[PDB]
Every structure is written in structure tokens, then in C-alpha cells.
């Protein structure tokens, strides 16, 4: 069997934020749990938002609303700009 993980992507981000710093295996296990936690929380609220409106499809509006409901004010304020920029560049490509 083969197990997937986010370790390589977390390391790429670390190398972008602090090139000289390293990370221990235990810290990597914590980060790998934090990512799955927030993923399940956002996907859960996006699913509830779809059923309350009788829609059959999840879209970027469901993700944006779930983000505004879950994260605090300043974090939500920045995360919404990051997601909008990413989707705009992807569609323009």
C-alpha cells in the first residue's frame, strides 16, 4: 500500500517563507492533520449550503460563503482575495 500526504507541499511553502529553516517529523505530522481538519470543515459547510437551496452542484460561491462563515473577519477578508485571484488567473489562461 501507498500513503498520500501533503508533506512535500508544506515543505515547498516552508522553503518559500524561510529558506534557511527546517522542520521536524512531528511538526510535519501536526501540519498534515491541520490541513485535513480545515478541508473537512469547509467541504461540510459548502454541502449544507447546497442542500438548503435545492442546488445539485457545488460552485465557487458555495466555497466563498463557507469561508466567510467559518473564518474570522481579517482571515476571511484576505482568503477571499487569494481565492478570487487564483480563479481569475486560472480562467484567463
Amino acid at each position: 500500500s501507498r500513503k498520500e500526504s501533503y508533506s512535500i507541499y508544506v515543505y515547498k511553502v516552508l522553503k518559500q517563507v524561510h529558506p534557511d529553516t527546517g522542520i521536524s517529523s512531528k511538526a510535519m505530522g501536526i501540519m498534515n492533520s491541520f490541513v485535513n481538519d480545515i478541508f473537512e470543515r469547509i467541504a461540510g459547510e459548502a454541502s449544507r449550503l447546497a442542500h438548503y437551496n435545492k442546488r445539485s452542484t457545488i460552485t465557487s460561491r458555495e466555497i466563498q460563503t463557507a469561508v466567510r462563515l467559518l473564518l474570522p473577519g481579517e482571515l476571511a477578508k484576505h482568503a477571499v482575495s487569494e481565492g478570487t485571484k487564483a480563479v481569475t488567473k486560472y480562467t484567463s489562461a
Partner: protein, 78 residues
């Protein structure tokens, strides 16, 4: 400034239902602030659900869902 509409007698009645026998003179201004902070967190969520649906009328279900998300399930309003 409508917070003054929550009068001292009403606060005393609420304290009586809670079993309080004697009340200090500074409890009123503390209670007004506590209620003002509580209402805002529910209204912000209700308006968020109203806007997602592109409606202009806030509906009872928006409030029911806003309260349930905070862990305060309310039975009786559907």
C-alpha cells in the same frame, strides 16, 4: 441609540425568573452590553444566508440556521 429601550424593570423581571433576590445598581449597564454583543453575532449570520440566496427579506429559517450553527438549537419555528 435604542439600547435604552431595554428598561431596568425588564432586567429585574429577567433576574427574578432566574432566582436573583437582591440586585446591585451597576448590573443594568453590564447587561445591556452583553445583550448588544450577543445580537450582532446572530444577525451577521442571518444576513449572510439571506445574501447567498439573493433575497431581500430576512426569513425565520435564516435565524434558525444561524442559531443551530452556534449550538443553540431552537424548537418551534420550523
Amino acid at each position: 441609540d435604542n439600547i435604552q429601550g431595554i428598561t431596568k424593570p425588564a432586567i429585574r423581571r429577567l433576574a427574578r425568573r432566574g432566582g436573583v433576590k437582591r440586585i446591585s445598581g451597576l448590573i443594568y449597564e453590564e447587561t445591556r452590553g452583553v445583550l448588544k454583543v450577543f445580537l450582532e453575532n446572530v444577525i451577521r449570520d442571518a444576513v449572510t444566508y439571506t445574501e447567498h440566496a439573493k433575497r431581500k427579506t430576512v426569513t425565520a429559517m435564516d435565524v434558525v440556521y444561524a442559531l443551530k450553527r452556534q449550538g443553540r438549537t431552537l424548537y418551534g419555528f420550523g
